[PDB]
Amino acid sequence: PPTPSPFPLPPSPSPSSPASAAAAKAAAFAEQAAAQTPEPSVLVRSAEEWIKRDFFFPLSHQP
Amino acid sequence: MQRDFVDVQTRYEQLVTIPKNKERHCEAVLTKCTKPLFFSRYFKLLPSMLYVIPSKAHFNTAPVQPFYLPTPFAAYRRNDCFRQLHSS
Amino acid sequence: RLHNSHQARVLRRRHVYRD
Amino acid sequence: MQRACEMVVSLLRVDALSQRCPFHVLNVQILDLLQREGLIRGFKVDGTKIDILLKHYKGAPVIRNIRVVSKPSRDIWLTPHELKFRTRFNTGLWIMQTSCGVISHRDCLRMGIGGKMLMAINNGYQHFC
Amino acid sequence: VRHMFLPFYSKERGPPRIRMQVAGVKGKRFYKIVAANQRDPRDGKHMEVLGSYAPCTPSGVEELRLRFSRIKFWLAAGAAFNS
Amino acid sequence: LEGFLLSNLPPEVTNNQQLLSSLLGRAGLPVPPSASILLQRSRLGRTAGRCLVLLPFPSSAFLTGEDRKALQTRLAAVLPAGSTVTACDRNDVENCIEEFERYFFLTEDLQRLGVPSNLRKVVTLSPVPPTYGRREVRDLLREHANVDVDPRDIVFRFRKDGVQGDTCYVLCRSERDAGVVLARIQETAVPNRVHYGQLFGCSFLWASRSALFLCDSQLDYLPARSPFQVFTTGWEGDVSEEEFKNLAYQLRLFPKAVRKFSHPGGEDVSSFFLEFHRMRDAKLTMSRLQLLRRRWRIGANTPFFGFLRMADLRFEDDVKFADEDSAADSDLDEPIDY
Amino acid sequence: HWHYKTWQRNTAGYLRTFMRNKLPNNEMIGYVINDKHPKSIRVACDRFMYVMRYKKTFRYTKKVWAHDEESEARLGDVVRIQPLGYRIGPWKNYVLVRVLHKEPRD
Amino acid sequence: YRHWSRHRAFDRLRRLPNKALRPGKCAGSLFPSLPASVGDAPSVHGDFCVVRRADGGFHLVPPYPPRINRTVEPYPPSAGNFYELNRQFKLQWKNVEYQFVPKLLPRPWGRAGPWGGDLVRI
Amino acid sequence: SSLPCLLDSELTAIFQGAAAKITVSSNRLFKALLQSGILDRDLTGSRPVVEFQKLCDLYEEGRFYRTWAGGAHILKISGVKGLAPPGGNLKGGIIDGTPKHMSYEEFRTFVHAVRVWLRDERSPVPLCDATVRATGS
Amino acid sequence: STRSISGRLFYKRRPLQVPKLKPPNIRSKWLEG
Amino acid sequence: LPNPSVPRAALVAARFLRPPGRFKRAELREHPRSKTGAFANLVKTAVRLREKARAFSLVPPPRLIPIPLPARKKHLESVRGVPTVSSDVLARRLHFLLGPAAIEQQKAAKMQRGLTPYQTELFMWERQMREIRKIYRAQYLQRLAEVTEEERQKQLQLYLQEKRERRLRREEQLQRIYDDKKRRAVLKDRMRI
RNA sequence: AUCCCAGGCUGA
């Protein structure tokens, strides 16, 4: 069964550059969404769509 | 039932299907029954299909509502092409 | 940004001048 | 990319307290990753240049090696299950650029995202391209 | 034929069937139960591997491995088979 | 330009009078709360998906090609996607009105054709161009066969979308007339449309006996007995079911069951419905019947045998029509072979 | 023509070059290199191949003739084109879909 | 390789590939609808035609006149010992004749197919 | 009103004049047809003059080049290099753009089609494209 | 070490620049393999 | 030019008909040619049809203006032809067919003159086979419908997630770039002053 | 053009 876990809130004093901080915020939210959302089968989408998703989003924890 | 296919089917038709068909308003179309039988190496014919039209004895083929055709559509009616003799 | 072909360079321009 | 491949030289100095390198936002982000990993004492941004204050331990420097992977004339990308194999059994830092920012190969592996391999710090002798 | 199973029917090769391809080596022979078209080569083109059948086995009992759900699916699709 | 024919209208639009009127008003045609609307409905009061919009023609008689283009573009833009819009002149309007009438009164015409006495008098013509009607079929038969048939016993096969099929059934006044039609109408060139005062497009019509009708109380539930049934006729009058079983065995016909059909009057010929175990057996028996026809030298168009099939039934209470039910699995009764 | 092996087709470089090449409906992007003929344009399109041996991607140019119903694609404009499945006349094989960048005129 | 400069060959017979008849696709469309995908749908019957039979039935027949590749010499080389190497296939009804020789066409072939010809009535 | 059909004698005269079995380039055929003014007479019977541009557009849209095997000469000349469209072979190459040389029957069919299309452009009810698929909703 | 795959024509240039030593068993070339 | 005329019914009915092989093709072009049908002469048919059609005015081919197809993402839809029969009925039928009742029904099947005992049981045996084939189709279709409902839900959720997050990223980037340009423009204007 | 057709229709 799935075991969702809390994702730590990114710090909001910045220990890095502002661009790094923004990337960290976006990455945290994206990884939480990827953990909490499932994925359908290959046949729903095309090869190029899957490749684009793979390179743009963190992989889902529930294939 | 140990009673045989024809016997069981006929009895069920007598008990249930026939009264239902008599009470239900019916209609006849030729859309799906016209499909030809697929050819094979041992059968390459288009034999005539016998369409068994429902009869009024077992089916209530009367219209639910009378036919309607108002003006100015009536002025175009081809009176000679049908024997139904429609009127407003 | 690797492939700076003619089409790539045309499409990669935010503004007329890079001040 | 050119600026990062240049900053490799400034990072690989020995017998120096601090060294300068060319400025770039990508350089700043890689320096942020390095400081979070505790490989440099710090750095300062001064106009066209960045002054990196390096860290040492028992004489030798903390940064013992830098292997460049992605050059401006050739990108290198990896799927998660290729990154796992390539970084197998190594304590070094492989810097990865992804849609989620410049992170470490361990963050990339946990996220399962496709990334671009830029540099390997203290990776010993482990490379494929 | 229902629209879903049309690709399973080949104009050049014929309708789908559930049959057995020879497998193994000279002497040691078993069979791979597959779904193919009627005019495909016996050991050649096929659509799916549905199981295997070994009449001679060390245990002395004929062994039959089958994907039950897939056999049901191909029977529903209309694959023919022999005695 | 007399009007527009809208086809494949969605059921929502067909059923909602207000929506269609509002759409036409937005397009430009003023529909009174002027242009007139007529829907295609069957005897069950169910819209077939076709609408005829007759423009006001004390004034539209001065319309031109530009006006036609503008109005058609506006109608196409306004109406739902998937529904086609066509321009109709007076001939097209007449054809549409006759088509709606025949669609409504198809059942009675089918019963009248199926009257058992007309078994050998119905001729099937195909492919009839859509512009043709009963009068056009009568004229064609007169011209190309020198045969006169009643223009009121001609029945067009309809499609699931309400549009006429390319098949006609004509009740010739005599079996001689039917045979003459069959012999004459073979690959006959026929104009497709009358436009600009000329004849445009050629269609090659054929005649045959490929749709036999029988309406009787003895056969209403006959087809339900089995799916593999072959009708046959042209035998001697006095032969009973057992004698015909013996005759069929002698002729090397092997039916699972035999059912004689008799109707009041006309005992010169005895008709029998044979029943078989498999569709393969039915088809092979039909092939042997064709062979026996050829070896016996009877007319190739003579009514000898056929494949029984109940006409599609539609009932008022039905929500999904059996012919339109995508879940049907009757194809499993007919294995495919190459 | 070049055939990639099964394992090669799973690599990140191959997948990313395939993603770059592919578009919905097999559309392509290019720029106009010929606008003399009416309702026609010759378009140069960037196309990439991944070389396994050296683990890098090189770019080449694909030049095709498309159909332009109107007259809106001049020389040096960036456009998106779609294949037809048939050859209109002796040359044209694509159809203009949209104009991305327009070189200033007049 | 050769990057030399040479004059165009005007009198050379350019040979073409051999292609056989396509059986067709049972999953194809006899009467194609509006295509939602770029490209014509395949034909159910391919290069064969349904035609009436002498026994009252129908059967599939190859096209006439034959689709031939005349850019290549007849094979085997001894084919002339048994065949008419210049055989011609005419289309004449009464006094009207048609000159039609199928030949390969440029791609994309699509629904129309690889072969075509001109309209020449005599 | 009505659309009279042109005379085979007049069409043969125009075809032979353009030429001076027999195939004549579409350029010469179109120029001769436009000079004869026959289309103008048809339009007057059924506002501006027909243009060489209009003839070219109708020829393209009717796509007679594909229908009457207008590209077989490409395969005759180039060979296998003629199969692929422009750009199919990344090396490049020359593809002849010669428009089709119509025979008499092909020219007659083209003329009939042109007259019918020109009539349809103005007639309230056309022969072709009388039905248009709705796109909005 | 990647200076030999510079530019766009690496895939045709670099495969030409390789060792050109004699075949291992060219001493018996007249046996024709 | 045209092919010999043949009904659309024959066109449809020949869907699964295997085309002739090499020898069967050779058998159709022999000289005795006894197999040729009515109005099916190879040399004459096309010309005859052309001449008959010429008697009337030819309708011109369609004018085809090429347009680009729109780009729409593939969406999984609910299965259409799903029987509504009940799993209880299917279970009863399967129990009958796969139990010992089918063999007894085969034994009890009646014979017709001309058939051996095996055939009369085979035909009844095949009658049960047509039933079980229909039972498998219903179960497979219902299970597929359930799986498709699940998959449709998953795909919808994934699409919504991706769309929302990409929209947020684009909004952030646009805001940042807009502020940058906003300051740059004022700086440049002051320099030009 | 009249050799064949276990192919057809017609003639007041």
Next chain:
RNA sequence: UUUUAUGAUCCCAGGCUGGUUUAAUAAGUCAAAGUUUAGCCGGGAAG
């Protein structure tokens, strides 16, 4: 006017594809390219 050093014009030679195990922290797909029952394809003619 159309192609052309991104190789046009223009010679000679070659159909393409798959095959499970596979040692070494060299593998989670054998890892630029090496196959073996097989896959796809490979005119027409009694004139």
Next chain:
RNA sequence: GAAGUUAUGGUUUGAAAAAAAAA
């Protein structure tokens, strides 16, 4: 049925057609 698909070896010996003009 459609859309994309790096060429290699023989060392190779760069411009080829159309059009214009010519008689």
Next chain:
RNA sequence: GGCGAGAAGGGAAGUGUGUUUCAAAGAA
């Protein structure tokens, strides 16, 4: 009279063959 029948083809074709990514409905 009816079905099946290529000694299971390497004789053509280089930007070709094949591969990869797709798509293909009657009963309208």
